[PDB]
Amino acid sequence: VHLTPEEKSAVTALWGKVNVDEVGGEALGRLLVVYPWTQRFFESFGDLSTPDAVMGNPKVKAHGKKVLGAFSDGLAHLDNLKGTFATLSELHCDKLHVDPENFRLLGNVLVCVLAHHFGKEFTPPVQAAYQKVVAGVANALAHKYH
Amino acid sequence: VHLTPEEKSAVTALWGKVNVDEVGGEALGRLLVVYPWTQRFFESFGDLSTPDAVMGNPKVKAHGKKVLGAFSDGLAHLDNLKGTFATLSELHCDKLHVDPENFRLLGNVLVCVLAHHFGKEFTPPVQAAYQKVVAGVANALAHKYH
Amino acid sequence: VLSPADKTNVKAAWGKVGAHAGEYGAEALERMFLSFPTTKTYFPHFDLSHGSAQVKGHGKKVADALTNAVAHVDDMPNALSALSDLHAHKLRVDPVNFKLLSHCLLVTLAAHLPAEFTPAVHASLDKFLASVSTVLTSKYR
Amino acid sequence: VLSPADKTNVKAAWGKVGAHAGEYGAEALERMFLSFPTTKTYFPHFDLSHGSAQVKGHGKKVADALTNAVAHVDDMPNALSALSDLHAHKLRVDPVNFKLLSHCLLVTLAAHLPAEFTPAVHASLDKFLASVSTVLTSKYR
Numbered sequence: 001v002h003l004t005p006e007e008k009s010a011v012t013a014l015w016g017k018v019n020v021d022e023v024g025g026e027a028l029g030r031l032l033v034v035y036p037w038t039q040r041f042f043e044s045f046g047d048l049s050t051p052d053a054v055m056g057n058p059k060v061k062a063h064g065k066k067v068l069g070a071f072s073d074g075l076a077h078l079d080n081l082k083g084t085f086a087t088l089s090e091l092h093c094d095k096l097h098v099d100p101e102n103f104r105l106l107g108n109v110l111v112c113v114l115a116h117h118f119g120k121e122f123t124p125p126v127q128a129a130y131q132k133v134v135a136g137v138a139n140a141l142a143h144k145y146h
Numbered sequence: 147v148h149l150t151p152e153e154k155s156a157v158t159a160l161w162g163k164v165n166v167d168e169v170g171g172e173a174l175g176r177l178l179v180v181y182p183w184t185q186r187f188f189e190s191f192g193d194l195s196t197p198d199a200v201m202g203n204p205k206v207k208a209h210g211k212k213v214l215g216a217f218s219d220g221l222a223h224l225d226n227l228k229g230t231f232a233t234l235s236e237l238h239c240d241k242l243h244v245d246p247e248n249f250r251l252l253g254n255v256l257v258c259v260l261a262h263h264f265g266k267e268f269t270p271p272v273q274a275a276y277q278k279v280v281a282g283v284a285n286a287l288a289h290k291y292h
Numbered sequence: 293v294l295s296p297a298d299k300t301n302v303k304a305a306w307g308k309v310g311a312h313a314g315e316y317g318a319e320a321l322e323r324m325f326l327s328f329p330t331t332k333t334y335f336p337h338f339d340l341s342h343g344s345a346q347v348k349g350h351g352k353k354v355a356d357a358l359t360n361a362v363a364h365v366d367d368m369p370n371a372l373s374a375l376s377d378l379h380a381h382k383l384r385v386d387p388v389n390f391k392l393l394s395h396c397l398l399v400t401l402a403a404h405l406p407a408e409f410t411p412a413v414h415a416s417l418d419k420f421l422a423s424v425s426t427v428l429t430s431k432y433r
Numbered sequence: 434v435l436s437p438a439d440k441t442n443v444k445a446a447w448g449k450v451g452a453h454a455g456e457y458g459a460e461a462l463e464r465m466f467l468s469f470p471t472t473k474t475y476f477p478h479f480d481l482s483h484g485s486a487q488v489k490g491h492g493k494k495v496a497d498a499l500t501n502a503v504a505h506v507d508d509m510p511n512a513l514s515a516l517s518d519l520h521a522h523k524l525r526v527d528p529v530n531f532k533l534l535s536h537c538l539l540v541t542l543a544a545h546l547p548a549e550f551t552p553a554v555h556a557s558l559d560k561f562l563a564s565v566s567t568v569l570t571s572k573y574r
């Protein structure tokens with residue numbers, strides 16, 4: 001993560017006005033709905049029969065709530081995304097076995113949730129900035145696969 | 147790259163009996179043929195109209211010859227694939243702009259050339275070993291994309 | 293494959309886009325070039341600065357090639373049959389780039405239609421662009 | 434799409450495989466589980482040790498599901514229509530895994546048919562498995 005001062009501000013300014021509670025479940029939710037196979041990891045959450053059931057399952061808005069944390073966390077430790085995610089990398093890999101290609105799917109659905117919640121404020125340059133961050137994050141968790 | 151002693155031997159024993167000259171063009175060649183879009187980077191090589199023209203173009207068996215080098219090179223520096231490829235990473239990224247997803251395609255077509263040239267000697271465990279190496283290499287060149 | 297429920301959401305969401313189609317078609321391109329720098333190696337003779345009337349003009353091509361799909365959805369492999377040769381044969385556009393686009397195209401729509409960008413239509417749109425991407429790459433298969 | 438020249442290479446290469454089909458169908462699986470550890474999260478009730486008669490037995494299913502494709506190539510979306518629901522609906526198999534397999538399946542064939550694994554047939558095979566993979570995932574589109 002380089003984040004030039006221009007980008008550094010775009011990511012901070014925006015990220016600061018983010019509904020850290022709701023936005024977190026908004027992503028996880030749409031992931032299970034748009035990429036069905038992913039529900040294969042949250043069968044202990046409940047009814048994921050329809051999108052309405054997924055967009056309401058309390059187990060989901062509680063997990064997405066914890067996911068968003070790791071971000072605010074990594075976002076406050078760009079200079080080292082590897083160290084911060086060491087723990088979660090061992091968890092998602094040698095225990096959950098999620099494929100690293102699915103960390104990119106989640107980082108993008110997130111970018112779509114931010115684009116939806118901030119509409120126009122979410123300018124192209126603001127995206128190209130977050131895309132870098134998401135990417136940097138998707139590479140830390142995938143780190144333990146070596 | 148971990149390479150446990152079992153794997154370390156499988157990769158060495160095999161790699162030692164490799165026709166370092168011919169095998170190198172065998173891969174590059176089949177890449178342009180099986181993944182056509184990739185020819186978009188070697189238009190200065192000549193006639194790539196048919197596979198026969200690609201599997202003979204001298205420009206190709208000379209470039210594949212240099213590619214295989216970097217491998218024998220990285221293969222002799224597993225403990226640090228990042229440092230060794232620093233140069234080539236800047237080249238393929240901020241100059242050639244090849245997408246990192248195409249370094250995986252080449253590493254696999256290579257595994258197929260080795261599987262073809264050593265047939266049965268190329269046991270599953272020998273593959274699962276090389277696959278790790280290829281992967282480790284495909285991540286170094288892709289490194290400068292951060 | 294696309295289901296009747298999907299068809300309805302694509303035709304629904306595209307309708308609500310209407311008039312701005314071309315505009316939107318050039319906002320996805322800029323987002324791409326910016327977020328995915330590597331995709332510019334295709335538009336040299338192009339000006340990729342914020343105002344390029346070349347990017348605006350192209351956004352109309354893409355936008356109407358898509359509107360050409362939503363209206364003939366049950367038959368894309370024939371309507372798009374032509375854009376299949378150009379992207380695969382002449383241009384040699386790497387298949388990954390069709391993914392990078394489609395993404396920016398969903399990140400554009402959500403920033404313009406915060407009402408109907410429901411988790412469902414979102415999924416319907418992603419399947420639709422997934423089918424378009426498949427058809428334009430088909431000439432490789 | 435697959436061309437007559439492709440059809441010929443698939444039907445050609447598969448013919449030369451014949452009798453060993455099932456054998457080969459279980460060698461690709463082991464290669465996968467080994468090289469791509471993450472793909473085992475689907476076969477728990479399975480024994481994935483070198484001799485598993487469960488892996489051998491499954492390799493026959495896959496092998497004959499493929500032989501079912503080469504013979505009905507012009508019509509896979511219907512013949513395979515069924516294996517489409519099972520992999521997409523019931524199983525929820527991630528689309529990436531269809532790529533990991535197809536690879537091991539080409540790394541198997543080359544290690545058994547060093548004569549006809551020409552750069553061309555290689556390309557023809559890759560397109561064929563590319564079309565099979567697409568059809569089994571289609572139920573997502």
Ligand code: HEM
Pocket residue numbers: 038041042066067068070071088092096098102103106107137141
């Ligand atoms: C952007 C990358 C991701 C982040 C930031 C992330 C973060 C987390 C965190 C913080 C936890 C729980 C930690 C705790 O409970 O203390 C977790 C658990 C888990 N993650 Fe991820 N994750 C990511 C992507 C994914 C993806 C793509 C999947 C695949 C479906 C996934 C599947 C899981 C599962 C199944 C659990 C639940 C484990 C449990 O029941 O505790 N994660 N993740």
Ligand code: HEM
Pocket residue numbers: 184187188212213214216217234238242244248249252253283287
């Ligand atoms: C496994 C990863 C790869 C390795 C080991 C590798 C290695 C190399 C090396 C050593 C050079 C030339 C260095 C020199 O001339 O001194 C080179 C150049 C180049 N590579 Fe790669 N490369 C890889 C993958 C790719 C891929 C996937 C493409 C995409 C088509 C590609 C496109 C290029 C191009 C176009 C050049 C030629 C530049 C010239 O004309 O000198 N490479 N590569």
Ligand code: HEM
Pocket residue numbers: 331334335353354357358375379383385389390393394424425428
């Ligand atoms: C959703 C998928 C896409 C659609 C619907 C689409 C549609 C089109 C259409 C209709 C044309 C213009 C025909 C003309 O005006 O003569 C075109 C041309 C072209 N497209 Fe795309 N395209 C898409 C994705 C891509 C991608 C992913 C790339 C590259 C990253 C690409 C590269 C090009 C190029 C190079 C041209 C020629 C433009 C020029 O150089 O003047 N297209 N596309």
Ligand code: HEM
Pocket residue numbers: 472475476494495498499516520524526530531534535565566569
């Ligand atoms: C080339 C593509 C593939 C073909 C042709 C294929 C074909 C088949 C066939 C014919 C069946 C067995 C039906 C039966 O005996 O009742 C099956 C079942 C199954 N396949 Fe595949 N398959 C392929 C790829 C995959 C992949 C990539 C995975 C996972 C990584 C997968 C996971 C499964 C599972 C879980 C079953 C059920 C087996 C069991 O648990 O008993 N398949 N497949």
